[PDB]
Design a protein around this ligand. Structure first.
Ligand SMILES: [Ba+2]
Ligand SMILES: [Ba+2]
Length: 327
DNA sequence: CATTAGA
DNA sequence: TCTAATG
């Protein structure tokens, strides 16, 4: 957590590079496991050799460990950190819609900058277009104060179209957080569950609502169960307009809400931990359900959930408010 | 780890 | 269809 620090950090820096700038999936996977194991080790690594006894710790990385331990740096790392092409790739990637594959290609062509990208709006897809368009506001954080404002509206139209809707704004938002990155809307309806052959409109109806009123302003992607877009709070009585915010709405079988909700509400650790516990408590949890465990090794059969509570009751735990779902 | 765009 | 990109 701190004794192993430089090493892991360095390591992940090293991995992230192969992954992005190069296409060395394996090298990439190689740095990562090591970085993983060195991180668990209970002692201060004092040399490669020591490190090296590790699983996944080979000659190559051990050799990097010495250089780092000896000199407080690493040339490859300094060389990469310097590398304009490689810098370029890391950068283009911040554009929503630009993954690595694209980054390299863009660079290939000579498009390294933000402006480059402008000048070539044509070479970009609608996604990347919006990404581009809203590069600043995409990078900006979302004050809870706004999250509040946003959630308000959202619940308003939802209810508007059909009273029988259920919408939850999941994530750190959900967990109190002073600020969020984007807004997560988990959606469901009785008339939709496990078997009940869809009702894509269920999704459709709402997005359309949100738009109608101007909450939605763009579409990154719209499918029959997962809508992904851009929104904005009504810029008041002038002098102050609001930043473009990423939003995501998704349909869910009413029969799987709570788990999904539970699960999407996090935290990543609270989850892992509760989950670990349901294992002992003779269960299994996962984004959609909660099944009892059968001794044979495994088992099935989804216990019924009507609230975040049920899942709790099931593993006989303390209902934890989302506030303190921290870990 | 599943959903969507696109080519 | 596959393959990239999001989460
Ligand atoms: Ba070894
Ligand atoms: Ba990106």
């Amino acid at each position: 957590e701190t004794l192993n620090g430089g090493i892991t950090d360095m390591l992940t820096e090293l991995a992230n590079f192969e992954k992005n700038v190069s296409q060395a999936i394996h090298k990439y996977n190689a740095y990562r496991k090591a970085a993983s194991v060195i991180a668990k080790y209970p002692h201060k690594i004092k040399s490669g050799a020591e490190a090296k006894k590790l699983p996944g710790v080979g000659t190559k990385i051990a050799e990097k460990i010495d250089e780092f331990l000896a000199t407080g740096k690493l040339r490859k790392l300094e060389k990469i950190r310097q590398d304009d092409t490689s810098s370029s790739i890391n950068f283009l990637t911040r554009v929503s819609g630009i993954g690595p594959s694209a980054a390299r290609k863009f660079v290939d062509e000579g498009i390294k900058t933000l402006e480059d990208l402008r000048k070539n709006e044509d070479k970009l897809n609608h996604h990347q277009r919006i990404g581009l368009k809203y590069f600043g506001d995409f990078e900006k954080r979302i004050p809870r104060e706004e999250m509040l404002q946003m959630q308000d509206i959202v619940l308003n139209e939802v209810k508007k179209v059909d009273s029988e809707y259920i919408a939850t704004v999941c994530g750190s938002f959900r967990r109190g957080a002073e600020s969020s990155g984007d807004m997560d809307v988990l959606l469901t309806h009785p008339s939709f569950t496990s078997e009940s052959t869809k009702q894509p409109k269920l999704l459709h109806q709402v997005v359309e609502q949100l738009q109608k009123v101007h909450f939605i302003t763009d579409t990154l992607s719209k499918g029959e169960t997962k809508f992904m877009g851009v929104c904005q709070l009504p810029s008041k009585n002038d002098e102050k307009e609001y930043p473009h915010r990423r939003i995501d709405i998704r349909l869910i079988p009413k029969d799987q809400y709570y788990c999904g909700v539970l699960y999407f509400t996090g935290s990543d650790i609270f989850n892992k931990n509760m989950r670990a516990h349901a294992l002992e408590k003779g269960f299994t949890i996962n984004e959609y359900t909660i099944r009892p465990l059968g001794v044979t090794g495994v088992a099935g059969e989804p216990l019924p959930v009507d609230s975040e509570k049920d899942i709790f009751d099931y593993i006989q735990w303390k209902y934890r408010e989302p506030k303190d779902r921290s870990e």
